[PDB]
Design a protein around this ligand. Structure first.
Ligand code: NDP
Ligand code: TOP
Length: 159
């Protein structure tokens, strides 16, 4: 089982300038709840994006995908291919617009957070993968974050 998890603006933007372009404090706990105790896979840039005090993410086996055989990632496992990263029975791909695209075909689950923020795509932004009709989903109820942004959770699956 390979699952993807991300938070996106309605527009599909998930990253800009190397950061997540919004504040949603409730996201951290939902992300934790889903990923805790599992192996997590991320692209090198997502690893770099993680604050130094929080990486590697605690309670999870951190796997970082990189083309540099010499890449240094303390507390994480650096691999050079997707096949080497997906060996666990339950793996969660936590990032990179690139890595989500790469891992989507191996996936049978997607946990998505839609952020109701006006943020049109700009050239160079990290974008979420598009889910075609092979996916079946359930949309949760919109809620208000204390940051003032409205958001909702989606759960998709396919066999
Ligand atoms: N909103 C959300 O939920 C999330 C948003 N993000 C955002 O996403 C952005 C980063 O996304 P993005 O720029 O696409 O980067 P990625 O995180 O996907 O990392 C891309 C890197 O992964 C490695 N890589 C990619 N493909 C391969 C491959 N086929 N084989 C081996 N290594 C590979 C390379 O590392 P190298 O160059 O070292 O070889 C490449 O530069 C940031 O802005 C981040 O904040 C991240 C996570 C969640
Ligand atoms: C928990 O800390 C982070 C987690 C993530 C990945 C991530 C965060 N939220 C969601 N919903 N899906 C994800 N894959 C990405 C981050 O920065 C890009 C983080 O630092 C803020």
């Amino acid at each position: 089982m390979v699952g993807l998890i991300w938070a996106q603006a309605t527009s599909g933007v998930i990253g800009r300038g190397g950061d997540i372009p919004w504040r949603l404090p409730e996201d951290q706990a939902h992300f934790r709840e889903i990923t805790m105790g599992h192996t997590i896979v991320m692209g090198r840039r997502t690893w770099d994006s993680l604050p130094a005090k929080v990486r590697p993410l605690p309670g999870r086996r951190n796997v970082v995908l990189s083309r540099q055989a010499d890449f240094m990632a303390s507390g994480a496992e650096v691999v050079g291919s997707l096949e080497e990263a997906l060996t666990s029975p339950e793996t969660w791909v936590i990032g990179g617009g690139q890595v989500y695209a790469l891992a989507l075909p191996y996936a049978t689950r997607c946990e998505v957070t839609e952020v109701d923020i006006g943020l049109p795509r700009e050239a160079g932004d990290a974008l979420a993968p598009v889910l075609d009709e092979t996916w079946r989903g359930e949309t949760g109820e919109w809620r208000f974050s204390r940051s003032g942004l409205r958001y909702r959770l989606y759960s998709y699956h396919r066999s």
